[PDB]
Design a binder for this molecule. Structure first.
Ligand SMILES: Nc1nc2c(ncn2[C@@H]2O[C@H](COP(=O)(O)O)[C@@H](O)[C@H]2O)c(=O)[nH]1
Ligand SMILES: Nc1nc2c(ncn2[C@@H]2O[C@H](COP(=O)(O)O)[C@@H](O)[C@H]2O)c(=O)[nH]1
Ligand SMILES: [Mg+2]
Lengths: 202, 200
């Protein structure tokens, strides 16, 4: 039962989620794919504080292939060039949907390798110096209620201030507005399905 | 006279612009900042051909200071296996105001292209066809005195410089910038800045 989601719905999902995510105090955002970036950018509008430098967003692409799951960093982050130091940072990973969780699992896994390798380059010892550890969190618009094919750490999933889903939803296909080649039809369906705005004008 | 722009307006600006941009045949897109990335991603939906790998989008951030250019977030070409040689590259931003941002973005990316051509032992004078072809797409190009220029072969080629709309010198409020999307959309509708293409 295909669920059509309007732009304004996504906007308001980000709006309400931002209030929760403030408790995580993200220092930067890493967005998975084009679908991750749009919510990430909208989120930033709601995280912005006047006089405070806007939170940086980094786009990454992960490709996963059948093993004999193999992971390829199709588009990654040049931490040195960007002067991005993950040590002692709160990092929010953003994607539009958590379906089987495979993508989020391997993205987190890869980013943890980056952080560990940086904390070692600095002659930092994350065991002796725990406060230099990187704190990862996740934000998705939709977390599907279904058997997952991959896990996420318990301290992530079971911490309401680390794993953030705007909505936990049935196992249905979600059609995002940026994916549509007929936004008029798409928005008409979204309104009919109750997938448009849910917060009134201020 | 602030102009409120709805999400659906942005979507349809990209839809019509894609028909023009197909003539440029972009191989990849480079999006400037968060405001560039959204139209870039929407454009990709309209450039997609089934059975053909999706066009890659790379995000960059340029900082310009009182001009001093800083590559705040750039592209690791080697890591991304991105070769600009012989490519048609579309640079995307949401707005061309004074043109300063586009001027320096193009300048910096051209340096990358030349650098990569030389590393491949390619004399672009002798083999002009291997040169990198840059194009630009913005949602709005403001009609006003510009503070920087773009190449004549860019600006005067309808198949290189693409503005969805050429507009008066007013401030454009994009939907992703809004903290009240309901007010924002109501204003956009009133202003005639919503949809302009019917359902299929
Ligand atoms: N548009 C859309 N894409 C989905 C949906 N479910 C999964 N996907 C795509 O499948 C990918 C893999 O999701 P995963 O199963 O790894 O969590 C997602 O990144 C997304 O690209 C959906 O309901 N709607
Ligand atoms: N939202 C919005 N931003 C603008 C507008 N005009 C200029 N800007 C911001 O100013 C930046 C510099 O524009 P430039 O003058 O270099 O073309 C743009 O990238 C954009 O971030 C506008 O009308 N609306
Ligand atoms: Mg995604």
């Amino acid at each position: 039962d295909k669920q059509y989601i309007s732009y304004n719905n996504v906007h308001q999902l980000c709006q309400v989620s931002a209030e929760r995510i403030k408790n995580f105090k993200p220092d930067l955002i890493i967005a998975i794919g084009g679908g991750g970036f749009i919510p990430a950018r909208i989120l930033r509008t709601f995280l912005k504080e006047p006089g405070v430098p806007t939170i940086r967003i980094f786009a990454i692409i992960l490709s996963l292939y059948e093993d004999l799951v193999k992971v390829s960093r199709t588009q990654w982050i040049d931490y040195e060039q960007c002067k991005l130091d993950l040590v002692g940072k709160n990092v929010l990973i953003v994607d539009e949907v958590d379906d089987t969780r495979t993508t989020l699992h391997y993205a987190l896994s890869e980013l943890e390798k980056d952080a560990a390798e940086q904390a070692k380059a600095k002659g930092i010892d994350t065991e002796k110096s725990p406060e230099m550890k990187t704190n990862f969190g996740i934000f998705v618009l939709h977390d599907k209620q279904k058997p997952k094919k991959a896990d996420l750490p318990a301290e992530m999933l079971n911490d309401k201030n680390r794993y953030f889903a705007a909505k936990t939803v049935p196992d249905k296909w979600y059609a995002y507005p940026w994916e549509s080649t007929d936004i008029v039809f798409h928005t008409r369906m979204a309104i009919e399905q109750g997938n448009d705005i849910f917060i009134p004008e201020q």
